[PDB]
């Protein structure tokens, strides 16, 4: 009850900032997550015994892949923590509960391969889930873990609040399918500009939470340059492995995934920043002004990639 998580001074201060890196000490990440739940939601919203057991089962169901791993899960949860803490009064109690858990669970049992590779491989999951293949699997894995004995962290919610929070988590995890991001942001851009955007309109909130999920999911591009640059290695380690597996199916992979075309990564990063990341954080800053530091950090990293091409690094 009166058992608070407390971080060392540097972490206590820096965890509040959007560009916080959770560090290389894996055994501190569960504590970092509980700390964020306690401060973002309250010391009462989850039973610590059940939360701790849920966290360790979620950890166990992330794989030993270069990028789509347990560290990514906690990193994405921290970006969501930073957004919720900088927008105190905009979100309900259930939303704050749902979204931290959604971010922690959003890539459960990821194998480091895209929806495209599963379909071309003809993986069983592609027959079970025709669109947002891995994202439907991630939500399925979340419900499975919630249903383990002693793992239902929502047990003390009413029946309607329980159905609401599982609905929040489902939409939040589906929204991390980047194929859905393009149309979601376009609609939000139209609604903001025409002035029709209404946060009391449930379908509008859903769209805003989807954009928050894209923003947290892509947040490696909002870190200090050395973190962004070193995370890019892990991201491209998976892309190149997938490229290898495409060549084994007798398919030339797109340049993004071809380890022979390593030279084209810097220009590939420019396209991603300009087509995905900058537009994402721009629209997010328009709807939620206090998230502006994510856009500023993203712009700084675009400028660093431009310097890489110009041979200045
Ligand atoms: C090429 C590229 C470079 C990157 O740096 C990143 C990236 C930065 C942060 N996260 N993240 C990321 C996100 C999903 C999976 C793996 C990594 N993403 N892409 C990327 C990924 C999927 C589709 C895609 O084409 C699209 F979006 F245009 F359809 C582009
Ligand atoms: Mg994902
Ligand atoms: Zn992710």
At what resolution in Å was this solved? 2.0
**Elucidated via:** X-ray
Give residue 139's Cα distance to chain centre: 13
Which residues have C-beta atoms less than 6 Å from ligand 1?
A: 178, 218, 220-221, 235, 256, 268, 272, 275-276
Q: Where do the domains of the chain lie?
A: 28-310
Nearest CA to ligand 1 atom 2: 272
For the domain covering 28-310, report its CATH number: 1.10.1300.10
Which atom in ligand 1 lies closest to the alpha carbon of residue 271? 1
Near ion ligand 2, which residues have CB within 5 Å?
107, 176
d(CA 75, CA 89): 23
Contact indicator for 99, 170 with CB cutoff of 8 Å: no
The 3-state DSSP class for residue 312 equals coil
């Amino acid at each position: 009850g009166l058992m608070q998580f407390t971080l060392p001074v540097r972490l206590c201060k820096e965890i509040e900032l959007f560009h916080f890196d959770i560090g290389p000490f894996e055994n501190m990440w569960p504590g970092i997550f509980v700390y964020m739940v306690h401060r973002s939601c309250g010391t009462s919203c989850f039973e610590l015994e059940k939360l701790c057991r849920f966290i360790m089962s979620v950890k166990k169901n992330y794989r030993r892949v270069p990028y789509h791993n347990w560290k990514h899960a906690v990193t994405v949860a921290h970006c969501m923590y930073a957004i919720l803490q900088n927008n105190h009064t905009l979100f309900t109690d259930l939303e704050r509960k749902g979204l931290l858990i959604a971010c922690l669970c959003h890539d459960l049992d990821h194998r480091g391969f895209s929806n495209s590779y599963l379909q071309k491989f003809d993986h069983p999951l592609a027959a079970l889930y025709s669109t947002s293949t891995m994202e439907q699997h991630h939500f399925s894995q979340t419900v499975s873990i919630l249903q383990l004995e002693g793992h239902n962290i929502f047990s003390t919610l009413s029946s309607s609040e329980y159905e609401q929070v599982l609905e929040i988590i489902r939409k939040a995890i589906i929204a991390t399918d980047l194929a859905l991001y393009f149309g979601n942001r376009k609609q939000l851009e139209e609604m903001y500009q025409t002035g029709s955007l209404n946060l009391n309109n449930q379908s509008h909130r859903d769209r805003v939470i989807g954009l928050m999920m894209t923003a947290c999911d892509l947040c490696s591009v909002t870190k200090l340059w050395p973190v962004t640059k070193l995370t890019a290695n892990d991201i491209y380690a998976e892309f190149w492995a997938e490229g290898d597996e495409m060549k084994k199916l007798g398919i030339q992979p797109i340049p993004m995934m071809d380890r022979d075309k390593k030279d084209e990564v810097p220009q590939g990063q420019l396209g991603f920043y300009n087509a995905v990341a900058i537009p994402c954080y721009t629209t997010l800053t328009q709807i939620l002004p206090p998230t502006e530091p994510l856009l500023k950090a993203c712009r700084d990293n675009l400028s660093q990639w431009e310097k890489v091409i110009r041979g200045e690094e």
